[PDB]
Design a protein around this motif. Structure first.
Motif, PDB file in Angstrom:
ATOM      1  N   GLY A 104       0.644  -1.316  -0.001  1.00 55.93           N
ATOM      2  CA  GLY A 104      -0.028   0.107   0.127  1.00 55.93           C
ATOM      3  C   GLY A 104       0.805   1.311   0.007  1.00 55.93           C
ATOM      4  N   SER A 105       0.403   2.257  -0.338  1.00 52.78           N
ATOM      5  CA  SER A 105       0.867   3.563  -0.354  1.00 52.78           C
ATOM      6  C   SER A 105       0.992   4.000   1.115  1.00 52.78           C
ATOM      7  CB  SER A 105       0.010   4.531  -1.256  1.00 52.78           C
ATOM      8  OG  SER A 105       0.454   4.450  -2.510  1.00 52.78           O
ATOM      9  N   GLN A 106       0.123   3.537   2.052  1.00 55.45           N
ATOM     10  CA  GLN A 106       0.400   4.016   3.232  1.00 55.45           C
ATOM     11  C   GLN A 106       1.773   3.564   3.587  1.00 55.45           C
ATOM     12  OE1 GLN A 106      -1.469   5.675   5.032  1.00 55.45           O
ATOM     13  NE2 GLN A 106       0.019   6.107   6.820  1.00 55.45           N
ATOM     14  N   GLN A 107       2.359   1.997   3.360  1.00 52.46           N
ATOM     15  CA  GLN A 107       3.544   1.817   3.727  1.00 52.46           C
ATOM     16  C   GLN A 107       4.771   2.629   2.956  1.00 52.46           C
ATOM     17  OE1 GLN A 107       5.624  -1.915   1.970  1.00 52.46           O
ATOM     18  NE2 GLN A 107       5.967  -2.144   4.547  1.00 52.46           N
ATOM     19  N   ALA A 108       4.546   3.374   1.844  1.00 50.14           N
ATOM     20  CA  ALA A 108       5.388   3.892   0.932  1.00 50.14           C
ATOM     21  C   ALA A 108       5.537   5.139   2.072  1.00 50.14           C
ATOM     22  CB  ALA A 108       4.718   4.432  -0.278  1.00 50.14           C
ATOM     23  N   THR A 242      -1.184   3.116  -6.402  1.00 47.45           N
ATOM     24  CA  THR A 242      -1.734   2.191  -5.484  1.00 47.45           C
ATOM     25  C   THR A 242      -2.720   1.332  -6.397  1.00 47.45           C
ATOM     26  OG1 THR A 242      -3.048   1.520  -3.437  1.00 47.45           O
ATOM     27  CG2 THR A 242      -3.511   3.599  -4.358  1.00 47.45           C
ATOM     28  N   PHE A 243      -3.232  -0.064  -6.064  1.00 42.65           N
ATOM     29  CA  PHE A 243      -4.300  -0.566  -6.521  1.00 42.65           C
ATOM     30  C   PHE A 243      -5.232  -0.533  -5.708  1.00 42.65           C
ATOM     31  CE2 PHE A 243      -0.497  -2.575  -8.573  1.00 42.65           C
ATOM     32  CZ  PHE A 243      -0.988  -2.830  -9.932  1.00 42.65           C
ATOM     33  N   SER A 244      -5.339   0.384  -4.570  1.00 39.17           N
ATOM     34  CA  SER A 244      -6.430   0.205  -3.731  1.00 39.17           C
ATOM     35  C   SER A 244      -8.061   0.872  -4.469  1.00 39.17           C
ATOM     36  CB  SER A 244      -6.270   1.320  -2.650  1.00 39.17           C
ATOM     37  OG  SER A 244      -5.585   0.676  -1.725  1.00 39.17           O
ATOM     38  N   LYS A 245      -7.714   1.724  -5.408  1.00 38.58           N
ATOM     39  CA  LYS A 245      -9.150   2.451  -6.030  1.00 38.58           C
ATOM     40  C   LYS A 245      -9.194   1.953  -7.432  1.00 38.58           C
ATOM     41  CE  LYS A 245      -8.041   4.963  -2.390  1.00 38.58           C
ATOM     42  NZ  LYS A 245      -6.647   5.540  -1.841  1.00 38.58           N
ATOM     43  N   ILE A 246      -8.299   1.272  -7.946  1.00 36.92           N
ATOM     44  CA  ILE A 246      -8.359   0.972  -9.418  1.00 36.92           C
ATOM     45  C   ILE A 246      -8.389  -0.529  -9.492  1.00 36.92           C
ATOM     46  CG2 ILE A 246      -7.104   2.867 -10.413  1.00 36.92           C
ATOM     47  CD1 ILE A 246      -4.591   0.943 -10.614  1.00 36.92           C
ATOM     48  N   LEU A 247      -8.277  -1.392  -8.527  1.00 38.44           N
ATOM     49  CA  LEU A 247      -8.491  -2.863  -8.364  1.00 38.44           C
ATOM     50  C   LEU A 247      -9.336  -3.121  -7.344  1.00 38.44           C
ATOM     51  CD1 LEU A 247      -8.116  -5.997  -9.361  1.00 38.44           C
ATOM     52  CD2 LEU A 247      -5.588  -5.483  -8.336  1.00 38.44           C
ATOM     53  N   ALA A 248      -8.886  -3.410  -6.066  1.00 34.83           N
ATOM     54  CA  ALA A 248      -9.587  -3.344  -4.655  1.00 34.83           C
ATOM     55  C   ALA A 248      -8.392  -2.977  -3.785  1.00 34.83           C
ATOM     56  CB  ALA A 248     -10.080  -4.893  -4.709  1.00 34.83           C
ATOM     57  N   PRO A 249      -8.899  -2.690  -2.504  1.00 39.04           N
ATOM     58  CA  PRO A 249      -7.885  -2.480  -1.576  1.00 39.04           C
ATOM     59  C   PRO A 249      -7.412  -3.744  -0.931  1.00 39.04           C
ATOM     60  CG  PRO A 249      -9.696  -0.895  -1.489  1.00 39.04           C
ATOM     61  CD  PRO A 249     -10.154  -2.046  -2.229  1.00 39.04           C
TER      62      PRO A 249
ATOM     63  N   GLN B  69     -12.410  -5.452   0.212  1.00 35.13           N
ATOM     64  CA  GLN B  69     -12.367  -4.108   0.737  1.00 35.13           C
ATOM     65  C   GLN B  69     -11.112  -3.965   1.650  1.00 35.13           C
ATOM     66  OE1 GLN B  69     -12.759  -1.035   0.764  1.00 35.13           O
ATOM     67  NE2 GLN B  69     -14.925  -1.043   0.284  1.00 35.13           N
ATOM     68  N   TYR B  70     -10.846  -2.526   2.028  1.00 29.84           N
ATOM     69  CA  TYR B  70     -10.022  -2.395   3.103  1.00 29.84           C
ATOM     70  C   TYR B  70     -10.570  -3.126   4.486  1.00 29.84           C
ATOM     71  CZ  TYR B  70      -7.761   1.890   1.136  1.00 29.84           C
ATOM     72  OH  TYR B  70      -7.080   2.828   0.324  1.00 29.84           O
ATOM     73  N   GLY B  71      -9.606  -3.281   5.197  1.00 33.14           N
ATOM     74  CA  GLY B  71     -10.003  -4.090   6.664  1.00 33.14           C
ATOM     75  C   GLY B  71      -9.685  -3.136   7.774  1.00 33.14           C
ATOM     76  N   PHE B 280      -7.669  -9.831   1.687  1.00 37.08           N
ATOM     77  CA  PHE B 280      -7.936 -10.824   1.054  1.00 37.08           C
ATOM     78  C   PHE B 280      -7.129 -12.339   1.423  1.00 37.08           C
ATOM     79  CE2 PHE B 280      -7.363 -14.100  -2.635  1.00 37.08           C
ATOM     80  CZ  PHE B 280      -8.585 -14.044  -3.283  1.00 37.08           C
ATOM     81  N   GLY B 281      -5.731 -12.192   1.876  1.00 40.62           N
ATOM     82  CA  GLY B 281      -5.036 -12.949   2.522  1.00 40.62           C
ATOM     83  C   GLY B 281      -5.529 -13.389   4.019  1.00 40.62           C
TER      84      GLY B 281
END
Ligand SMILES: *Cc1c(COP(=O)(O)O)cnc(C)c1O
Ligand SMILES: *Cc1c(COP(=O)(O)O)cnc(C)c1O
Ligand SMILES: O=C(O)CCC(=O)C(=O)O
Ligand SMILES: O=C(O)CCC(=O)C(=O)O
Ligand SMILES: O=C(O)CCC(=O)C(=O)O
Ligand SMILES: O=C(O)CCC(=O)C(=O)O
Lengths: 404, 404
Positions: A104-108, A242-249, B69-71, B280-281
């Motif tokens: 995630g971008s949070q980690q970036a 990030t793939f969060s809003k273009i794939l799934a978070p 989704q986000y968790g 997902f994991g």
């Protein structure tokens, strides 16, 4: 706690960490029958679940040992390759950059804090900015300079003014953090002249630019912007996707693109924080991009959210009383509202909730918590009928607040 | 780098971060034709791919929005519930603890450093200990005290001696980090008496115990140990589990169990480092445990690795020259070898590679890098034919090295 005064064990930073009373209240709101405009989530109706099912089958058929084993810290090579090709062709980003995959971008954002910030180093943010970026960076104890936005993004002229003032104090900025397209939370986009102005400043004053871009593909109107990273001749920009809003978070996959020397340091820092980003999700994302599914899905995401943005903008125009103002985003997930001062929107949330609507008070989005009359509204994850009703209830809440 | 002296931007901790020459050499070995005993990976033959395929189908049929989704930062509730039930029934761990899901135990170790360690706080580790734990903790600048192992794990009596010496200096330890079952890298297991002794010390000297347990289910002989966390009546132990060796590392899911006050602080810290562990994991892991697949699969992992441990232990006995000693693990992934001293196994690695075999030199595993005659061998992800040949090559390398 079973240990009594457990605080006796905690580090100086842990002792400063707290729960937000507002984020806590909003958690309670989401699970109740209030119409919440406070969310920050993409709508699961936009998750490409058929494409994801097909990709999962393909991974168990052809890629299972790769998807299930430990990965390198830097990321799954085929994802890193397909991303750089996508970014070069689609956005004009230079192939001289290197790329690392993030959890995630949070980690970036946390890794940017680790790798760049000593206590007291100066970070420029927009006012407002993304609250979780302040949260990531705060662990590293920077000092912030906040630069207002207007309807064309960061007021880069005020940044030049503040850079000159800091220089006269013998001080300088290390990093400027910007969310320049469909900002969370403001919804506005930095115009092209400002992007190039920012990069001239970055050269003149010697700082790094972090461009966080979760939303550039969620464009509903207008023409594509040029990424700040596409204008970056000097290698001064670190671009976050990030793939969060273009794939799934749920896969928690993002990427960081920038100068190879910076990326190498980031790789070392990440190795001890989480070893590697989950490789199963990296393989899913790789198929999603390389298989052309991203390209095919982005129009369905835009078709889904555009009418939701529009319903909310219509409802604001029709219901809001005199002196309320809001942004008019071309994309993304948020509309940002300014209350004829000095309503305090944090104080007003109690009233709004009582009238069956919620939003995020804008104060948390300011590094200095010094602006009190703003709110973030979200249109992605609730529905046109509730957008209209929610905005009406918010409008009546503001009319009531404007009296005694 | 395109920015020239890119170091001018880096934080003090970043400037100290370096790549390891040994680890880089070993990454190059892995890809090539040498027999490597240096790996730390589980064998993908033990990944339960059919069960994984069935769970993926199930998730897309019934749980798709939740998996995608986000968790929450704390973790997916059904996974947290199923793990505390598994832990209670299988190991006797108390239900008064709380639990948080992590992005691997690597992330747990980083969050322990974040939450507990100020610069100079004293961490006790075993000698040897898990090198990635020293890496996670190093960012936080602890001082280490190292306590030797013998064939029954940490010499807890030497820890009492060191605690009394530190007390006489007016100093205290904050955390004891232990890998007490089938250690990585030593393979040995702390006996029951020592576990109870460690906990009396933790009470008398007021410190926290971190019990990192990736391997307890990978038992090939002997009877199950009691987890230190199962003996913990005071809430002083934080127990770390991971799905890396019992499911597959590619999902990057682990858990941390301990006092609710500590867990709450961990959750706040984690929120800004990665937002949430990939959901997902987490849903995959939830079906794996709750559906009874973990329980059914554990015997197949044991059946798989046991003969590889046994082949390695038979080869060492037949081929190793006089004065070489090794541990005799009851489980896990590693055997640890001691060279009749004088020999420096880091120096020797060059010679071993020239003879077609690799191992990890033991020096990196010591906080004080002060023991030079040890090696970590792995038996999981090389095959019995290659284990016998690799041990023979290593044996001949040591014979050659012993000739001045
Ligand atoms: C949505 C959002 C992100 C997403 O972060 P992830 O950790 O990738 O899910 C990052 N930055 C901003 C500004 C956002 O609005
Ligand atoms: C295998 C191993 C781990 C695994 O860490 P993850 O991040 O969960 O993959 C942790 N601790 C030790 C001592 C190990 O040997
Ligand atoms: O869980 C959340 O609201 C944070 C998710 C996010 O990044 C966003 O809100 O835009
Ligand atoms: O595609 C977007 O919405 C943003 C651009 C990008 O690469 C990302 O998703 O982060
Ligand atoms: O690549 C590696 O060996 C580190 C991963 C790990 O946890 C281990 O080796 O046991
Ligand atoms: O399962 C094992 O091997 C150790 C026990 C555990 O909970 C874990 O996997 O971490």
């Amino acid at each position: 706690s079973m240990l009594g005064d457990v605080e006796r064990f905690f580090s100086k930073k842990a002792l400063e960490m707290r729960a937000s009373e507002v984020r806590e209240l909003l958690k309670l709101v989401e699970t109740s029958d209030i119409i919440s405009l406070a969310g920050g989530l993409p709508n699961p109706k936009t998750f490409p679940k058929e494409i994801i099912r097909d990709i999962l089958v393909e991974i168990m058929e052809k890629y299972a040992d790769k998807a299930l084993q430990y990965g390198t810290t830097k990321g799954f090579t085929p994802l890193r390759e397909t991303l750089m090709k996508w970014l070069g062709k689609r956005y004009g980003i230079s192939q001289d950059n290197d790329i690392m995959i993030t959890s995630g971008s949070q980690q970036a954002l946390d890794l940017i804090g680790r790798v760049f910030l000593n206590p007291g180093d100066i970070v420029v943010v927009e006012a407002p900015t993304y609250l979780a970026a302040l949260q990531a960076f705060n662990f590293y104890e920077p000092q912030y300079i906040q630069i207002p936005l207007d309807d064309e993004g960061m007021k880069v002229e005020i940044l030049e003014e503040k850079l000159k003032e800091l220089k006269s104090q013998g001080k300088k900025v290390k990093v400027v953090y910007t969310v320049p397209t469909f900002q969370n939370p403001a919804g506005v986009t930095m115009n092209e002249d400002r992007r190039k102005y920012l990069l001239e400043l970055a050269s003149e004053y010697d700082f790094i630019v972090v461009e966080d871009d979760p939303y550039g593909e969620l464009r509903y109107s207008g023409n594509p912007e040029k990424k700040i990273k596409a204008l970056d001749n000097e290698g001064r920009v670190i671009y976050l996707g990030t793939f969060s809003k273009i794939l799934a978070p749920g896969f928690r996959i993002g990427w960081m693109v920038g100068d190879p020397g910076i990326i190498r340091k980031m790789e070392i820092a990440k190795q001890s924080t989480d070893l590697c980003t989950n490789v199963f999700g990296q393989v899913v994302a790789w198929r999603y991009v390389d298989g052309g599914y991203l390209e095919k899905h982005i129009p369905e995401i835009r078709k889904f959210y555009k009418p939701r943005r529009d319903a909310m903008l219509e409802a604001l125009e029709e219901f809001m009383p005199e002196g309320v103002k809001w942004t008019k985003p071309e994309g993304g997930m948020f509309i940002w509202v300014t209350l004829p001062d000095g309503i305090d929107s944090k104080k007003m949330l109690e009233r709004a909730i009582k009238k069956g609507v919620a939003y995020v008070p804008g104060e948390a989005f300011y590094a200095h918590r010094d602006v009190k009359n703003t709110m973030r509204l979200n249109f992605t994850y609730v529905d046109e009928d509730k957008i209209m009703e929610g905005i009406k209830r918010l409008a009546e809440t503001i009319k009531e607040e404007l009296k005694a």
